[PDB]
Design a protein around this ligand. Structure first.
Ligand SMILES: Nc1nc(SCCCN2CCCCC2)nc2sc3c(c12)CCC3
Ligand SMILES: Nc1nc(SCCCN2CCCCC2)nc2sc3c(c12)CCC3
Ligand SMILES: Nc1nc(SCCCN2CCCCC2)nc2sc3c(c12)CCC3
Ligand SMILES: Nc1nc(SCCCN2CCCCC2)nc2sc3c(c12)CCC3
Lengths: 396, 396, 396, 396
């Protein structure tokens, strides 16, 4: 067992390990598209003597963070150890090698989507966004008087075939991802994939329809087995008007009993209805996980709340450095120091604060984040908070 | 049909309407205890010609709000219209009469627990706290290295009969409710009720056990039908140590597969585990609903974030007044003005911001809260936010 | 934390730990009856500083083993560690102390019923009997021509109130337990308990009825929630005639769709029907677990198959001795030796072979039982096998 | 209605009756393969006046019986009566005709797989092997210290595409079926069928993967609807090492919660784990059914336990002959006699004892097997028992 970059002849073995390791694997001729996002030296394989018994890679991604700043981001994915080589330390070896390469390439952060919430904390990854399934019983749903877009005169929302309005979706998503923390550049090849999932499958998923507004879209389909449920796969809205308009259209799906969507905890949909409770939260999970690769480069890159006054402190990341952190005017300066640490935390905890989805107060309550001054805790809390709520772009 | 204060001879008719209207009604000799919390002229009945076809009352409560300030609070409850007198405007008449009496008595706020999330918005009530059911699969649960109270040496947590350690629970709850927004004074008679629910029922609920720490307690019981589920009815912890210690004890219930609890969205339990995901959010609802009875008295009474700098603005509540609002140094001054409104909202929306559980940004996104300056929105957001997270005390 | 025999004043604390540790606990005034089966120095408690945080005891039992031989048996039960004192090594301390006392008292074997199949292997306990739930769809059930007791003329089976025919049940059970491996003497106090479970509970279990034959009985009751299911709590038959007669009566319960019973894997009921498949096996578990306390005393006490010819060998139990074992004429001689071991196994594996419910071939296939001669394996297999099939008496 | 051998022009009508009679029918161009195993005069059809309203056939099979002896075996299958011709005695006519031809061809035994356990007893078929579904919760599964193949150094097990390692599977199965009672020669055409079921179906079964050891294999696939369940379709192991190695690989399927397999009651898997209970028995049924066509030829062909001493007796099969049976040195001599019968049974009961999966004691308890000497019962029991446990090869 040795660690190597895969050659063209390894990929068939990687696809076999993929098929056996991921229930949701989309076959090799669709994995061709994701491969384009893997840089030269983005992948490691472990061979036995030889078949692939281990693999991991990263993709080149652009992640939006608070202050509408776009970071280069190594997206970890396609991580797998053969069932025949468990408890052999292959993951520890592969992750160490990719993190070496990710750091040496100058990525300030790495990101992934977890298959279990227990594996990735020990490698410096912290859950950074929260998924929120809302299911609406749309038979009872009435919009509030105060809701926009309920006036006698035209609807701006159209029902369309997704495949025929790609450019409009691309345009809206591009505007969306640039102004929202958690947003990812979605390259051409993943739009090719998204619109091939939109056509009906023989004895699989049903036809996907689109609701198109000048400033937003929604892709939805009826569930395979529950024919009274509509699953909103993706809703992107740039303006509050577009968000409300699109929800009026979805509550107008009179053949459905329930609309379900995976959104963020600050989704305003409940407040659009006369009865907040009709939009039930039916499921919550960690979305994107973040590993801060370079602490000073990442803390300096994002914006901070203009509301909190200027303040200084010393932050220690366990096996990650000690830094004089000064925050004011929504910018941070982060420099090396040997001064006494006022605030200590593991690198994963920093990942979790970074997009401003978890409050420092909460992590401190669990002792994930040590300090002896609670004034500094309130300040971190307010500084790291995000004006624009954190959303999740797409699974990779 | 006329509106009257009930006399001693009306209560049997009220109890009949209660039994027919509330599935969870606890019989008349236990309703005797709650009656003590109803002031003279706290109740209205509607008689037909005569049996009770309508009733509503308020109880005298002390609600803790941000800045560890305790408000007198009218707690609405025992609201019911006979199934024979629907769409007759009896609720509108009864609520109007109680709100007249509540206001004239000098209560700055009123509060209730909703049976539906659609009834109470139009009477000025806004959902103000969020309930969060966490279910833990305790077979997989491992505490983090960073977690307190996992060191060789004594446990401070004891397993006890609830009935034999009342004074200790009372002491801990009193300390808890005084330092947490949403906290309610729990009077003697509701401790009498809480410990009568703690004994096993013939073909009903099972025996309740207590986990007692110097600085916290947990009441739990095994579910009636699911014998592998433990329901934590109530966990109160004053210190992070007490909260962690009590959870180590609950994960130690080796005969159970799952521990469920109703807590708040900022509960640190997920962050105590190596796997955040093992604490699944299985259910979310509006907890306490708030009606601000006197806008200037309530905005002046609570504390605000010291982090946001001093700022002034003009707030209009629909049919509720217009006020020059100046906030700085965590105090607010709120005075009458006829100046142009910068910020507008219905009274219910104010109820929802008041305990700092909903962000103004979120309500603004839904157009529940109108302004043309987004800088002022960020400021409201930060000012009204609560350092100590908002919890729910007990249903009334 | 120290290990002590409990005094009369400890038992209230033990009952508290019991109530919190066992979902099926029957309250203290019924635990009074089982207490009579606990000898002086049969119990250990661990106190903290003081409440009971740990307890274990054994009861004096008479277990029937192959060759209709009755062994004195320490029955372990009432084992519990407080949820506040997990991973503290209290079980290891308590089990060590009881095993010291059990051995020094001259018990050749100890036995228990497991709450998990993973705890008790490391303390020398092997699963020794197998439980088998058969559910019959009695609407389709027809007895075979070859079945006894289907002839024109009287039925010998009567439907009776259990409480009125105690002596007859006692008589039949006494005959049953003396001729069946796994049989236990059931003392007077556990008959007092068995017939108090036979009366209907308010919002609990339904009335128990009895089917009484001269040479067997069946206790059954309709399920709480499934009113088309009859649960046979206990069927004891001395003669094949009695077993068949009692099943004709149970298939005659025309208001029921299904009869369920927990029996042994060799129960002949399937072979009584024209359709073997109508008696579905719906559930299987380990019944009684056995720890051989004195290897030579236990191997010498039981009978062996007369069919296998005389043979000698050397058996090593890990940390349990090495013995020259000679078996012939259904007796064994077991003496100390330092000669080379032909057969090796952990003490738990011996427990599992002892009642002849597990085949040595099967344990050898799993490498629980090492030898290099497969002829000796066939011989062990045949010797240790039981003519009369192994059954489970009652849970303790 | 008359009984005829089908001509080439009957098969389309037979396939229609098949499609309407068997839910699991695989279409006509796959039935082409099984047809090759049907000898000339292996099939009967009943025509009405003309469409096929009745059919039955046998296939030429080689069944392994105790003593690693291989019998020619008529495998009954494709038995069907049109729903329009029930209770017309067509099955009785067709079975009589095939049994005439099977006997006259010199097959000592016939075998089938039942669609109901109630049809086939009256035609002389006895259930002879037992199926056992084990489901493992693989999250908790830990192998015992004593288990083979858990040492630092290479795994001998590989994850492979089934279609690319046919010869290896064939080799291992050939070795397996020759040394195990219940084993069947699997001809080339049924390997062609087995590896066409191994590829993913559009809106059907998922891709099948293989775990390959030098001395064993496992075919598994994720369930259609339960994506956390892996179904092991087939596990064949020649050595205990291979069996353990393959189970370590299956417990290493970390994306699955549960591994299910259909195996035999003596499968050693439970004993490989620290917790026997984690391998739950979730389902049991009759596997292969056996009809002894020639009693003396079949009793003479198989081996018997060498452990039981030489003994003689007289066996009567109802309408099947009376025989002087002498068993010693694991051989039997079976000759015609008119001497008094010591042991009587229906032919089906003999089928059930023949592979040594049912104990004579058990069948005697049900009066399926009459004798007045219980010493002779113990001897039959031991003689007919099988050293190597009885397994089920494949459904036909
Ligand atoms: N990165 C990829 N993603 C996907 S689908 C996203 C599934 C999300 N998971 C992600 C993990 C668990 C939760 C949910 N497919 C492929 S194929 C292929 C790649 C790749 C990389 C290069 C070859
Ligand atoms: N206030 C009371 N509460 C209760 S139990 C709390 C149930 C919570 N509900 C509250 C509403 C819906 C959700 C859940 N019982 C009684 S009796 C009695 C009173 C009263 C007042 C005076 C006579
Ligand atoms: N030995 C006892 N048994 C029972 S009920 C049997 C339950 C079976 N379990 C046993 C374990 C798990 C499976 C199923 N109750 C009591 S009270 C009391 C004793 C005792 C001892 C002295 C005070
Ligand atoms: N013998 C065959 N088997 C199968 S699939 C095995 C199904 C098992 N059943 C068997 C019975 C019920 C339980 C389960 N298919 C065919 S097609 C075709 C034949 C045949 C014979 C000649 C044309």
């Amino acid at each position: 067992v040795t660690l190597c970059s895969p050659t063209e002849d390894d990929w068939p073995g990687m696809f076999l390990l993929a098929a056996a390791s991921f229930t949701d694997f989309i076959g090799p001729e669709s994995a061709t598209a994701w491969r384009t996002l893997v840089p030269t030296d983005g992948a490691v394989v472990v061979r036995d003597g030889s078949e692939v018994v281990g693999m991991a890679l990263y993709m080149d991604l652009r992640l939006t963070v608070p202050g509408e700043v776009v970071l280069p981001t190594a997206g970890l994915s396609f991580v797998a150890v053969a069932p025949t080589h468990r408890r052999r330390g292959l993951l520890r070896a592969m992750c160490a090698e990719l993190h070496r390469r990710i750091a040496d390439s100058g990525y300030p952060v790495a990101a992934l989507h977890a298959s279990e919430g227990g594996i990735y904390g020990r490698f410096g990854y912290g859950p950074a966004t929260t998924l929120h399934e809302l299911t609406v019983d749309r038979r009872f749903a009435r919009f509030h008087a105060d809701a926009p877009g309920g006036g006698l005169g035209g609807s701006s929302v159209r029902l369309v075939r997704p495949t025929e309005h790609r450019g409009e979706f691309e345009a809206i998503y591009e505007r969306w991802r640039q102004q929202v923390p958690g947003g990812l550049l979605r390259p051409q090849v993943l739009w090719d994939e998204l619109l091939a999932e939109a056509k009906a499958a023989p004895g699989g998923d049903r036809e996907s329809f689109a609701l198109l507004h000048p400033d937003g879209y929604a892709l939805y389909r009826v569930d395979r087995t529950d024919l009274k449920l509509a699953r909103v796969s993706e809703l992107r809205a740039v303006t509050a008007d577009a968000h409300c308009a699109l929800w009026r259209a979805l509550i107008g799906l009179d053949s459905m009993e329930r609309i379900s969507i995976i959104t963020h905890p600050q989704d305003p949909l409940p407040h659009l209805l006369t009865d907040t409770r009709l939009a039930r939260t039916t499921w919550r999970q960690d979305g994107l996980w973040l590993r801060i690769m370079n602490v000073p480069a990442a803390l300096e890159a994002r914006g901070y709340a203009h509301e909190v006054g200027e303040f200084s402190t010393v932050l220690e990341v366990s096996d990650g450095g000690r830094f004089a952190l000064k925050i004011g005017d929504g910018r941070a300066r982060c420099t090396p120091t040997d001064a006494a640490a006022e605030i200590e935390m593991d690198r994963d905890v920093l990942g979790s604060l970074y997009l401003g989805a978890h409050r420092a107060s909460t992590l401190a309550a669990a002792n994930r984040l040590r300090t002896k001054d609670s004034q500094l805790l309130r300040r971190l809390d307010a500084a790291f908070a995000s004006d624009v709520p954190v959303q999740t772009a797409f699974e990779f």
